[PDB]
Amino acid sequence: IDTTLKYKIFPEQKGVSLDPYATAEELKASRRINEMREGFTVPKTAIDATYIDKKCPFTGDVKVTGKIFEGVVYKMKADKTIVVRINRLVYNKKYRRYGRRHTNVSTHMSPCFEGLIHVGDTVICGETRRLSKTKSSVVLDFRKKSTEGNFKRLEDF
Amino acid sequence: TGGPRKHLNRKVAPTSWKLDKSIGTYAIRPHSGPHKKDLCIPLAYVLEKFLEYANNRKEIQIILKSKNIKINGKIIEKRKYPVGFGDVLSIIKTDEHYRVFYGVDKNFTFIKIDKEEANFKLAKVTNKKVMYENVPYIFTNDGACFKYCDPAININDTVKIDLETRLVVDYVSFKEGDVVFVMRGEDTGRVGIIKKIQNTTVICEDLSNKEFETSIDSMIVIGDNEESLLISLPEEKGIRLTALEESNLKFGEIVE
Amino acid sequence: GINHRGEHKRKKSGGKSVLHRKKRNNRRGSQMAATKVGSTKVVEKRARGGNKKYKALRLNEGEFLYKSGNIINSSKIIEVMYHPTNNDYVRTNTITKSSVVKISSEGIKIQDEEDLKEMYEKGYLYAVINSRPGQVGKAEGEILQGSKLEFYTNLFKK
RNA sequence: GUAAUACUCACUUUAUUUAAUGUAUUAAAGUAUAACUGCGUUAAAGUGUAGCAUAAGACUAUACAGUAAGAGUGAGACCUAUCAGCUAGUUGUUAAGGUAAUGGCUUAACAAGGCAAUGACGGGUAACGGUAUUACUUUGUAAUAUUCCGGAGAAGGAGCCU
Numbered sequence A: 001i002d003t004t005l006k007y008k009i010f011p012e013q014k015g016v017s018l019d020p021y022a023t024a025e026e027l028k029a030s031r032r033i034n035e036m037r038e039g040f041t042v043p044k045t046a047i048d049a050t051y052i053d054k055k056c057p058f059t060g061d062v063k064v065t066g067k068i069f070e071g072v073v074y075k076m077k078a079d080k081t082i083v084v085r086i087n088r089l090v091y092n093k094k095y096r097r098y099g100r101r102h103t104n105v106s107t108h109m110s111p112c113f114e115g116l117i118h119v120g121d122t123v124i125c126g127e128t129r130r131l132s133k134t135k136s137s138v139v140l141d142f143r144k145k146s147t148e149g150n151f152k153r154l155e156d157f
Numbered sequence B: 001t002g003g004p005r006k007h008l009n010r011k012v013a014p015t016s017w018k019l020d021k022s023i024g025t026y027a028i029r030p031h032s033g034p035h036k037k038d039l040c041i042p043l044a045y046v047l048e049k050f051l052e053y054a055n056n057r058k059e060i061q062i063i064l065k066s067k068n069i070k071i072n073g074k075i076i077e078k079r080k081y082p083v084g085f086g087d088v089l090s091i092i093k094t095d096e097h098y099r100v101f102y103g104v105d106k107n108f109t110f111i112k113i114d115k116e117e118a119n120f121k122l123a124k125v126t127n128k129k130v131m132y133e134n135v136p137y138i139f140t141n142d143g144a145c146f147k148y149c150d151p152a153i154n155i156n157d158t159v160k161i162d163l164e165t166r167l168v169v170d171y172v173s174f175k176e177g178d179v180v181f182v183m184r185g186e187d188t189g190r191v192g193i194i195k196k197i198q199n200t201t202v203i204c205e206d207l208s209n210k211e212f213e214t215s216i217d218s219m220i221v222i223g224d225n226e227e228s229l230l231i232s233l234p235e236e237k238g239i240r241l242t243a244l245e246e247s248n249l250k251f252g253e254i255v256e
Numbered sequence C: 001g002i003n004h005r006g007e008h009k010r011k012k013s014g015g016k017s018v019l020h021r022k023k024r025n026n027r028r029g030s031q032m033a034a035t036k037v038g039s040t041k042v043v044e045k046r047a048r049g050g051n052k053k054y055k056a057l058r059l060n061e062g063e064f065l066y067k068s069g070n071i072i073n074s075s076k077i078i079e080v081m082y083h084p085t086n087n088d089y090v091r092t093n094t095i096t097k098s099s100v101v102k103i104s105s106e107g108i109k110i111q112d113e114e115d116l117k118e119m120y121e122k123g124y125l126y127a128v129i130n131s132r133p134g135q136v137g138k139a140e141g142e143i144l145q146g147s148k149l150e151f152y153t154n155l156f157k158k
Numbered sequence D: 001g002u003a004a005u006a007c008u009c010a011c012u013u014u015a016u017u018u019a020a021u022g023u024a025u026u027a028a029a030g031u032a033u034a035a036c037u038g039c040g041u042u043a044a045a046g047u048g049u050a051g052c053a054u055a056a057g058a059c060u061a062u063a064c065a066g067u068a069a070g071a072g073u074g075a076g077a078c079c080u081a082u083c084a085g086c087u088a089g090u091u092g093u094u095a096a097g098g099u100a101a102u103g104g105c106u107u108a109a110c111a112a113g114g115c116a117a118u119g120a121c122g123g124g125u126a127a128c129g130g131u132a133u134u135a136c137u138u139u140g141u142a143a144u145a146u147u148c149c150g151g152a153g154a155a156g157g158a159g160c161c162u
């Protein structure tokens, strides 16, 4: 029905059944939206859109259980995958100083956020069950890159 | 290790069994039952160590096969039967009855009670839903199912089992300002008055006006009010004085 | 025979891996059972801790549901029209999950719609399977109606 | 044997199986082979043909607790630059098969991804990991086959029945 995602099977959702001869608005009011944890809202693009994804947590099957982490994006080249860089500090007991370590975690990107998220801004994720060989978490919310000091003209004031 | 384990070791035995870590090597691994792994004890240790009725393995079979031992109103002849928390065991001869709960120093005790208390039993609800053909059900801690009860009993309230007709008789609801009993955690055997109920813990008050916080799963309310006192209390009443006052009673208090 | 372990694959960085233990019985597999069309045949399986499974080697007279009138009736299975992942199954006539077929319209009592009328003059109608044949042991599905018929018929052989 | 997938700690399993235990729900005439009796066989080890031969047996289903086990995520851990580039089921998307179950775990089609001086990829070990417990100490080091918990193997490799 929508050609944003190329299909090899009929794009319907699980458990949501209706009469076959159905209008566009009758199809639109029957999309099931999942429930979330506290502190998180479903986005505006999760409701008005028409896509069907198996792995997106809004209008999907995967339930998020467990901890919640954070990071900075590193790459956005492939499809529905982004690489989140996590920084932390370890403590050495002999020299009594700190070191810097880093990890890379590939996480699943929902089709709701399309033109918003760029390179170099924070993402709040959540851990789920396993989804691939290397994919285990899901993007939930984002914030823009901070603008502390930049050239501001008089119209920027 | 392709299957289950059947041998237990004396060094990893629970310390609340009051066993000696001397000459023995193995200990009795008890059967699966209604209680958990922590609140259960084997029966053969009760007739040997805590109660003193037998000396060796032969005299254990004599009392058990004579069918006088009555746990929760049922005769039992297996030495591996687990005696849990809160159950009442009795002998048919000599009219001796006991209630089983912890002492003050995280050890098992046995307290002689009366025949008016020998009838009933207390337990705590954990879960409730409606089963097949529109019949309500209430599930307790030990795994008994009960139907057609009062609708005022909620998920966390306690019940009173008659133990002979197996019918729910009385219940005590869950609220603040109730007397409480604890059975797990780092603090066991404390008896307290509820002050503040949080979503996961409870803020309580001892009889010595102290304070402690404890998760909701580890407690059981025994009475709604101080004047209720549905069961009989232990002799110490679970006060568990600190090491400071234990250092104060030995040498006197510090004069200032 | 066929394992489902993960200890043999390469790392995330691309370096080789090394094993330290033999093959376990916990992760144990089987071969593919391709369900054909013919005279009916069902064999039984034994799974872990009882729990018998049924596999079907040759299947016939699958059950289907009419969506508009909401009744269920049996029909025969004639041909396969489309299979999503591998296009060679249509020449060997194997039935798996989500593969559309061609069924007889004898016992079916249809309503009067514009699209189904021309095929209802002949004996044939269309249906799509929705159950795992090799593990449940029997096929069930839905009859194509409406815009769902508009989607699959662009993918036909023509 | 394994430098980490093994081990320790903190989390998840609505993604899963469990004989013996506890409390509950449900259902309820016909058909073989042994031991026995009797004829035998081969150096040994074992095995055969009869007596329509003849006994006991075999032809309910599920819940919720309770024990036991499987599967995931993250963090920690020896020496080496006279080892600086490495990887092609390798990284991802769709679909199916298979398992008690998540998952390139396996297979079709398409795409070009994935990791690195915060040390990738290689080489060595006279390398089973923690722990109870010993020493020496001014923010902590060193030993720990030895008590206990956990993992792997039965001359070397592979395959399978109950």
Ligand SMILES: [Mg+2]
Binding pocket: none
């Ligand atoms: Mg015979």
Ligand SMILES: [Mg+2]
Binding pocket: none
């Ligand atoms: Mg391929």
Ligand SMILES: [Mg+2]
Binding pocket: D144
């Ligand atoms: Mg060691």
Ligand SMILES: [Mg+2]
Binding pocket: none
């Ligand atoms: Mg040898």
